[model samples]
Target: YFPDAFLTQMREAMPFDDFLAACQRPLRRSIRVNTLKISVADFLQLTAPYGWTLTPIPWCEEGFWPLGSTAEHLSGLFYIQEASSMLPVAALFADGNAPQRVMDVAAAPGSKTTQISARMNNEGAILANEFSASRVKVLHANISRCGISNVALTHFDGRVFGAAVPEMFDAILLDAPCSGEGVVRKDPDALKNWSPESNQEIAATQRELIDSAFHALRPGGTLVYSTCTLNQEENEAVCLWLKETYPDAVEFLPLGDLFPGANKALTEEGFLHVFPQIYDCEGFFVARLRKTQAIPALPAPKYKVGNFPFSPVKDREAGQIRQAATGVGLNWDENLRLWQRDKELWLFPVGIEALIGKVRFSRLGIKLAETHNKGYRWQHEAVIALASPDNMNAFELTPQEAEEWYRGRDVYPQAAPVADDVLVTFQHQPIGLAKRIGSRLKNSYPRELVRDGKL
Candidate 1:
């Protein structure tokens, strides 16, 4: 299925026969354990009886090669992701600093954005921007499913970041869109219309995306530029363009020691130019660049932010939300900020305040609750993201009952209501909120997420 022109490029890069054989081999299913929901040790123990053996991905402690879909998967215990794709986020934090403000410039189908949020332990704010309007819903759903609350979604062409919010993030990830040369194994038709011209065109777009990513990144912060495709034009040339453009500001941080065998794919320029044959996975590239100094900022955006509807919750109102959440074992860290828009309440990262007027966001943080006459109705995302295991109102379900819960049916707990609002949990992981109507738990699992048949 390799295009003739692309095959010629691959032949000169590696042993042609090896690349051919590697491309034909099927990939092992890989997943990253969501530490946001459960500990790696706890996940190992939780699945001990399932007879599934997990082979760890070398660069990521939370990543593994053996995985699947089960209650654990649906409950947000793990995220199914390509093993190779985990590298960029891993590289982002390789320096060991958990940035308080981060950006995922091309964040759609949010594997990397969720990965970055998990790495941050949801501590800070992540600006997750997706250009395509249609894919934004999928991005939101996945972030919600992972129990992540620190991300703010934006719908814009990623190139806007350079001028819109320059030097705003402590770290940035640009997993640029590219020609599908690396995806042939996953989709056989990936290279059906392969042409040198396509890679050249995509390279130009990548340069623009990476340029914005660099500008949006704060000086002394890190930026991991990555792509799943294998061509030099998209992989190396794109990063080189930034270095050439800002010789004094861009520093290529070597990633040879990122993992034990990472050096095998290391390029002299300090990027991991992963070939599929070398990794036994997908073809990918990762470059860790540091913003050494400030650069000239592009003209600031002239666009309007429209009406910013949210306001800080009043001290009295904040007290009420805190008290109600505490009553349900949903206490949060002190740094988390609460905002109100109309009757809805949202929990935002403390750092999000500085970003409010600088740039527009499609959605900010997780909606915590909605006010009514009596008090507040807790949101499902709030429960999933903030509910603690020590919560007094937590209700654990049997294995069979968990399936019924996912199927969008009311679950009858063997025990009575500790409170009117219940934090529904599956295997100690908070899944959703349930209302105790007399003896039965009223299902609050989002209807759109309701699974049918065998969950």
Candidate 2:
């Protein structure tokens, strides 16, 4: 049932029988608790009534098992992600630290990017770039659901980052595309397109991407290269290629101590070559490396960086908007700052402006509000990200009411607020912004994010 070449290659490093058995077993279901939206303890407490059993992932404490219900799913309370996929980001911050600016070279559908955002507590700026044209929307969808607001997204060939923002990032993660051999447990037909020629083909693209990621990383910064493949050509060999390409500047950081049981899958070079059976999780490879010295920046890429339509807000305009927001029970938060694109007010991470002119962004940060005849109208995403649990103007919704609210229906929750605008929250966490339309609360949930069926 195995490819002749792959079986031999895997047999050399792991038990052939165990590897076969592991690939045949059904994969486990796991989810990463979104610390950006809720605390680990708070999430556990929220799910207490449910019979779901929680098992903390060794690599990421936020990761869990037995997932959750439809409400929890729509709540963005957690992300349903595979366990091994969480390790690369785990290794990036293996030292229990975070950098000011980081990049995820192949970030799409944003599993690692969102996880990195959570680990940073949404403090620093993250540039998440996905090469595929189609998956970009999926990535943004995850970012919104998880309440991540510090990311700037880009769509391009993954190799453009080095020249676009050469030596600009404090840390980088290059989860290169590879033959999906490691994911056999999750998708049994993952290797339906496998071959020696294919690994070589993917590895060439990986080399370019890793080279760009390494060049984009600042000296003394960390760069983690990873893939979801079991073969040495795609795993060890690809990293080795990067090391050879930058022999003087590459430093392989041993990840044996990254977590309690990580040594179980540790390779001699300190990379984790996780086999499906080894952890009863998906097969994934993760290697953490440091840029020992600076590399000369490449000439700027010949690609076009189209006109950036947004500009810094005038101090006078900023104050007027701030005053208006304050009038509605909102207060200034130093962690987030504002930008302007005409009448639209965008919320940017405190220090995200440094790389604005260096490269293009598919979407930069969240839109906080819009200026109008009435002064300022708060944005839904802004409410989700910045509204505090203690806001006095919060209109709590009943379970059925909450479900109706999510179904794009007006909520007639029994609340009478003095102001016309109010925050719609479930429990205490903010969901979206709504206006008090007399006795009915008008639904302002984004049409794209609106859900249907049972909670």
Candidate 3:
């Protein structure tokens, strides 16, 4: 199931027999709730009828089924993520309140980015950059699925950050690409092509990424350097190299107290070098390091700022939007700046201005709406992810209606007069946008996301 070299490394790190025994066990589905959309108590209440058994993830707040399916694609109830995969993001906010601008250097398929958003209470700006072009869409979809609106997406090799925007982000997470020694169960072929040389090659990339992450951090800000790999070269040695290379610039944060039993996996330097045996979960390594001081190492980037497309909405227009949003039970936050791209409206985070010219973004924030002849036709994304669900316009659905909602069909509820352009809810939660036409709702649920499975 694993390479001999990996087993040897495991033997040096922990009990080899126990490690192998634990790795053989299949991983039960584990999910972290999207607390931005639903509270733990509410989620527990919602899942109470399933004969559902939930064991709290010691680190995260929400623990329900392994990410809800019927509600996930439709309404964004929870996110599907691995147990160990949650640790890196967890370590990022271990110290306390997250800063306003944080960066996930290689955030494809957005696990940590969403977790970071939950920790910030969706208040801060998160720059989620994914290097893989193919995976960028999936990353954006996951962010949307988690109902997060503050993220800005960048499609580029994450290594560009050191020069592109140095000392700009308050905190960063570099869950650098590595040899998948820890993901044997998640992917059995992880060791089929494994080699020590490959680990070293991957470590070289990790080194470069860590360097960029360290340089990109503001002074005293933390950067978590983690990998799914379990080798010394990729795990400890790379961090050691970073420290040896920049002695005055990096400080290792002890994670022994991150969770109650976190000390079991603690290394001498206070890093969590988790083997499968230690947690009975996937193998992972999470080491939080602080930028101890400023490093004027990276050269300035040459950037050409394009003709900015969107202009700030006029005071009257802003007022109109605020009124409309408020009327629909959505609180239009003052912190968010509204922008116009033709007839389309966008809501941008406060921190986006600094990176507008510095880094190229693939997608810059939530697509708020499309200005219509009849006021504005709100986007499904804005309704499901960004709109406040607990409002006067929120309408609950029956099980049959909720099923119809997921199937991309217009819903007809037992009501007096259906409100036009109102937020639709199921299980007392906001699901999607719906415009009432007579007695039928013109389904604004995204067609691409409509589930074919039996509800």
Relative to the true structure, how large is the alpha-carbon lDDT of every model? 0.86, 0.82, 0.79
Candidates 2 and 3 compared: the better one by lDDT is 2
- The residue-level lDDT of candidate 3 at 17 comes to 81
**Pairs of colliding residues, candidate 2:** none
- Give per-residue CA lDDT, model 2, range 220-293, as digits (tens): 89999989988888889988998998899999999999889888988999999998888787888999999999
Q: Select the stronger candidate by lDDT from 1 and 2.
A: 1
- Candidate 3 runs further than 4 Å off: 64-68, 303-305
Off by over 4 Å in 2: 66-69, 304-306, 329-332
Candidate ordering by lDDT (highest first)? 1, 2, 3
Which of 1 and 3 is ahead in lDDT? 1
Clashes of 3: 0
**Candidate 1 TM-score, true structure as reference:** 0.97
lDDT of 1 by residue, 84-114 (tens): 8899999999967678899888888999999
- The true-versus-predicted C-alpha distance at residue 179 of model 3, in Å, is 0.4
> Which run of 10 residues does model 2 get worst, by summed lDDT?
65-74
Q: Which 10 successive residues of model 3 have the least lDDT summed?
A: 64-73
